[PDB]
Ligand SMILES: Nc1nc2c(ncn2[C@@H]2O[C@H](COP(=O)(O)OP(=O)(O)O)[C@@H](O)[C@H]2O)c(=O)[nH]1
Ligand SMILES: O=S([O-])[O-]
């Protein structure tokens with residue numbers, strides 16, 4: 001372990017009466033465009049380092065799971081009208097009407113056997129599936145298929161959200177969330193911000209949704225999501241405040257990216273791309289595109305990881321590697337408390 005050797009060279013604890021018990025602090029700034037996976041990484045730190053989610057905690061997310069599911073099916077059904085896609089079975093038109101009747105009369109996310117039946121039959125329909133497969137043409141929750149394929153379980157009367165159900169939720173974050181966890185005897189203070197108050201943070205973790213490459217901003221249908229993310233990364237990576245800050249890049253949603261890359265060409269995002277349309281070549285190209293935005297290459301190193309933030313095991317592996325980089329490079333700028 002090169003990290004253990006490196007940290008063992010520190011002598012600053014000796015200057016403190018109870019130095020060996022002192023807390024070494026690491027501040028991590030968590031950045032990235034909306035829906036890039038920041039809240040999910042936050043949830044994973046709780047799961048991995050601070051004892052997960054109990055069942056009662058999971059229970060609080062029940063109506064969030066229903067809400068996300070309701071939103072997803074409605075977005076697809078509504079898109080069918082705008083894209084002129086017919087139901088595969090004309091009998092589904094009644095189910096579609098009933099979806100709006102049921103969502104329309106409720107105060108918040110909910111589930112009944114009646115609604116489940118409605119959504120289940122809609123989700124199985126060939127025309128709905130065809131609309132689903134053109135989701136790049138509208139705005140659809142990335143977790144749509146996850147919840148809709150598991151609808152039968154979610155619809156059971158004594159349904160209890162699993163940890164993965166909770167990780168899969170999309171929750172509207174406003175403002176700054178700060179989380180604390182201890183790992184490898186470091187006391188991490190993680191800020192979900194998505195900025196001069198964080199000058200001289202130990203490290204930045206910047207999240208990018210790989211699967212955004214063929215999508216558009218909800219605000220401006222003309223604006224390519226990935227180009228927006230690059231511009232944001234450019235504006236962060238080359239900012240005065242962050243020269244001694246380790247810049248970590250999470251190229252996230254690699255699972256979703258791998259699934260669509262065969263069907264939908266990278267050229268939609270990068271017209272000049274002439275590589276093959278495979279997971280390997282297209283992901284590499286995106287990595288190179290982002291790392292290129294760094295204007296101080298022989299000064300600043302970018303530490304890139306491909307992540308699936310909903311996958312606890314991958315996030316645990318990636319977190320472990322990122323932490324070794326910080327221990328090897330940044331401890332001299334981390335204070336004791
Ligand atoms: N399949 C998949 N879904 C993800 C991944 N990362 C995040 N999500 C989902 O994408 C949605 C948005 O992620 P979120 O953490 O809320 O993004 P934020 O706006 O940056 O906080 C949530 O529904 C997550 O469950 C991933 O790597 N793979
Ligand atoms: O001194 S180091 O081990 O935090």
Ligand SMILES: [Cl-]
Nearest residue numbers: 035141142143
């Ligand atoms: Cl999403």
